[PDB]
């Protein structure tokens, strides 16, 4: 059978909780290439003739890992079907050691749809507007009981 | 220069220690430590390793892991 570290996946966010997380994440889609290009062209045209940081989800594996271990990230999403499993084996344990809540979601393809990329294998959010801060906090609190308390014996099931 | 501790690297190594569990030879070594003594554990490690210093360091690492386990 698989080692105890493996099979920690296959226990993931449920349809309701996953749908809620996607709905919350869908409100922070990062600016795509076309949107950024048109915005910059409009700004240049305005300048030629004569705002705070843009809140967005963090999805880069290196960027997400750097955010973790610094307590900046408030929530982290983990892809379960990552082909190089070694890239993701340490992420759950590292987050638990750092105390950062995380929720595993099935499908790297599904995860990537929220950032206009084919696959990202990871997703996280640090900045959040006031209108969504309460929703993010409630989702984080719910995820605790949904996952951590339901799989306290994840070390079993070789 | 010298190999500074680099606390970040120490934490990463400690986390990897738990993530990777123990190798089957490491499992045998710790089982013999808990049931056959560090005296025999060091000899087993030396038979399964090179210089005696490396075996002693490994035995110390296993002892530290056992102590941290409880």
């Amino acid at each position: 059978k698989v080692p105890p570290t493996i099979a920690q996946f296959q226990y993931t966010l449920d349809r309701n909780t996953a749908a809620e997380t996607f709905k919350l994440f869908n409100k922070y889609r990062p600016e795509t290439a076309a949107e950024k290009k048109e915005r910059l062209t409009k700004e240049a045209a305005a300048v030629a003739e004569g705002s705070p940081k843009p809140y967005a989800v963090k999805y880069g594996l290196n960027h997400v890992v750097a955010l973790i271990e610094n307590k900046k990230a408030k929530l982290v999403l983990i892809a379960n079907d990552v082909d190089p499993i070694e890239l993701v084996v340490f992420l759950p344990a590292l987050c638990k050691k750092m105390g950062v809540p995380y929720a595993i979601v099935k499908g790297k393809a599904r995860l990537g749809t929220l950032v206009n990329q084919k696959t990202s294998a990871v997703a996280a959010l640090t900045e959040v507007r006031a209108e969504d801060e309460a929703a993010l906090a409630k989702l984080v609190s719910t995820i605790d009981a949904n996952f951590a308390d339901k799989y306290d014996e994840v070390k079993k099931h070789w | 220069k010298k190999g500074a501790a680099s606390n970040r690297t120490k934490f990463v190594r400690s986390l990897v220690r738990e993530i990777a569990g123990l190798s089957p030879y490491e499992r045998r070594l710790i089982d013999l430590i808990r049931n056959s003594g560090e005296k025999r554990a060091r000899k087993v490690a030396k038979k399964r390793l090179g210089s005696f210093t490396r075996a002693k360091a490994k035995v110390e690492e296993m002892n530290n892991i056992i102590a941290a386990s409880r």
């Binding site: 059978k1 014996e153 070789w158 | 738990e18 569990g21 089957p24």
Partner: peptide, 15 residues
């Protein structure tokens, strides 16, 4: 050979 893992390190949250 087949025993549960131990959270000796992950038990304490980083401050």
């Amino acid at each position: 050979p087949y025993e549960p893992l131990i959270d000796w390190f992950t038990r304490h949250e980083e401050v």
